[PDB]
């Protein structure tokens, strides 16, 4: 008797933290495709918890799952032996990296960058203030947005003010903070501009400059990132680069159902949406 792999129907998606409606909204689109085509899907969060993906990712190798989407890494090396031992099960988009023997989906983030500062710089903002999820610092992945800012300083000879310089700063709460420092600072200290990286840091940001009688953008622009479903409903509709959800949701969904046999075989742009913040 041939005894063949019988699949579970089950696929796991691993994003950082549902609360961001960035990754609610990528979630919601790959789960529903997923539950269309018979899955049912586990979700995990890292955000608190780095020892997550290992917990997800042996998900997948005692066989409890078919296969997986990570929009989150935590250990790129981690995935790909994982990867290689379940060759069109692994799929990785938007985590700002590439993971051999795993199809990845590396959106264009570090152009994005580059192209929102040169808006901002073209609007004659010379002072920035520059906020990240990530470190300022470190040779690990998911530094393509930090490279681009510290690259585009060097390209308009602009000096790089490690005040202004914020990590690990990802919900609308820490931004408040960050505001209320930048608030704080005498006029000619300033930034002209803060890229925020986080329609989410945005809004907390501008909150406490306007609490502060700093006009947005009169006196500080405030550029997001990801065009939340709250961008264009806040105090000051954001200016943000727009993540374009559906199509990478899409995208992901049918490299995973490819692999996985039950699809045939067959460009993704960030764009700066511009609002009233910057
Ligand atoms: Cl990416
Ligand atoms: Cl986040
Ligand atoms: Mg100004």
């Known amino acids: 008797s041939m005894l063949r792999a019988q699949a579970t129907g089950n696929i796991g998606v691993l994003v950082s933290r549902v609360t961001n409606p960035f990754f609610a909204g990528l979630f919601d689109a790959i789960e529903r495709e997923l539950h269309a085509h018979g899955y049912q899907v586990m979700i995990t ?9 290992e917990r997800f990712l042996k ?6 799952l078919d296969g997986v989407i990570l929009a989150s890494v935590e250990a790129p090396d981690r995935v790909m032996a994982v990867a290689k031992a379940f060759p069109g099960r692994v799929v990785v988009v938007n985590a700002d990296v590439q993971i051999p023997g795993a199809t990845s989906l590396v959106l264009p983030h570090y152009q994005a960058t580059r192209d929102a500062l040169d808006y901002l710089f073209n609007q004659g903002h010379r002072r920035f203030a520059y906020v990240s999820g990530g ?11 930090t490279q681009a800012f510290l690259d585009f300083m ?17 919900t609308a709460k820490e931004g408040q903070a ?4 930048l608030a704080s600072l005498a006029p000619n200290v300033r930034p ?23 006009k947005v953008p009169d006196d ?16 000051i509709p954001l200016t943000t680069v727009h993540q ?11 490299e995973l159902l490819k692999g996985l046999g039950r699809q045939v075989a067959q460009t993704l742009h960030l764009s700066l949406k511009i609002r009233q913040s910057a």
Do not use: C
């Open 154 to 170: 060097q390209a308009h000879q602009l000096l790089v003010a490690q005040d202004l310089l914020f990590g690990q700063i990802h």
């Open 178 to 181: 960050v505001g209320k420092q």
């Open 220 to 235: 500080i622009a405030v550029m997001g990132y990801d065009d939340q479903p709250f961008a264009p409903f806040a105090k």
């Open 135 to 145: 470190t300022i610092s470190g040779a690990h992945h998911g530094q393509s947005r």
């Open 244 to 254: 374009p959800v559906a199509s990478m949701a899409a995208a992901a969904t049918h």
């Open 192 to 214: 002209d501009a803060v890229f925020t990286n986080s329609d989410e840091v945005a809004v907390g940001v501008i909150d406490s400059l306007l609490a502060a009688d700093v």
């Open 45 to 53: 969060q890292t955000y608190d918890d780095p020892e997550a993906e």
């Open 59 to 64: 998900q997948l190798k005692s066989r409890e």
